[PDB]
Design a protein around this nucleic acid. Sequence first.
DNA 1: CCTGT
DNA 2: CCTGT
Lengths: 171, 171
Amino acid sequence: SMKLTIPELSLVVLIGSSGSGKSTFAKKHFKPTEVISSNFCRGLVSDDENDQTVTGAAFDVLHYIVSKRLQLGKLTVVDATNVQESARKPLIEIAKDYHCFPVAVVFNLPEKVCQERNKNRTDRQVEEYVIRKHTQQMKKSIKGLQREGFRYVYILNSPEEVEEVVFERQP
Amino acid sequence: SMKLTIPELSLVVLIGSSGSGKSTFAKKHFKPTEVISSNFCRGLVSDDENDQTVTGAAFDVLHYIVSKRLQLGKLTVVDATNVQESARKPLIEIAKDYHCFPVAVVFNLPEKVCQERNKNRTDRQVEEYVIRKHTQQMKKSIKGLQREGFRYVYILNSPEEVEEVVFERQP
DNA sequence: CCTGT
DNA sequence: CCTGT
Ligand SMILES: Nc1nc2c(ncn2[C@@H]2O[C@H](COP(=O)(O)OP(=O)(O)O)[C@@H](O)[C@H]2O)c(=O)[nH]1
Ligand SMILES: Nc1nc2c(ncn2[C@@H]2O[C@H](COP(=O)(O)OP(=O)(O)O)[C@@H](O)[C@H]2O)c(=O)[nH]1
Ligand SMILES: [Mg+2]
Ligand SMILES: [Mg+2]
């Protein structure tokens, strides 16, 4: 098994390319209200979970919900790519505002895997350049995560490692 | 700063080249009796902390002491290079035997810094090739530490980061 | 997907 | 320093 220890007061930030399996992973390990998805927020504001033109509004809503949850001391999982430092920054800041611990969970899978999964999706597929870009951004992000303020940094390096994950929620 | 959370019952495994500052770090952050040094154990068995021919006996003694401490539920820090997977393996197994949390603290410093510190030591020095090899081994070790069984993996990427470290021991 | 060409 | 092959 791959045991990932997290405090009750965690902001768990999933970091991974489109096609890396973030949403599937979130559903497997967490209750629906614990997971706040950027795509779901695109849906909330626009009726379209895949409308990229409303990204600004979607993240405003996501950050607002994250703020309310952490204020109430509720463990929260951010299901978005989080592969740009500028995306992670407000999440860290909000977590610190409410004395919650940022946790990074990185889907460090080969680009080929994500591309194959994307090609086999029966839902929204992205163009190949999106996944190539996201993967490069994810890999460039790994080294600096602790310094950004992530108190726990967990890297998953293969589908086997992802599958072996067990979260251990320390009370 | 750079806060590193560790549970009260931890086996903290320092990972770094000779000259990376492991022993200094251990002295700053932990009780003298919490730190078990491989060089000290070379001294215990042979009178000579620098005698590499008694390495087998020294690590036998170190492992024995670690086992006794974890049996008694006492936090323990291994002050050795730990840059070889074969060195880390038996430590992970002892922690497992006694349900102790293994923690990795990596001194990911440039070889140049370790070489300079080594050159300026007054007590004991190693050959330059040793530090070149230790640094290569340290670097190759980073990716697989979580998979080896280290439940928390902390990488320190500069002297500035090492200096900023504060441990948070959680009851 | 925090928004090609 | 878990001993350069
Ligand atoms: N084989 C395999 N496929 C997966 C896994 N996780 C997700 N998928 C598939 O990959 C596609 C995208 O998964 P999703 O969770 O939406 O990834 P996301 O784009 O990062 O949110 C879907 O068709 C999933 O069924 C996995 O662990 N193994
Ligand atoms: N400038 C500076 N020198 C250090 C630091 N830590 C250790 N040193 C020096 O580097 C040399 C080796 O340090 P030591 O703790 O013995 O490292 P070790 O060989 O990895 O156990 C000693 O002479 C130390 O005084 C540090 O944080 N800053
Ligand atoms: Mg998704
Ligand atoms: Mg030392």
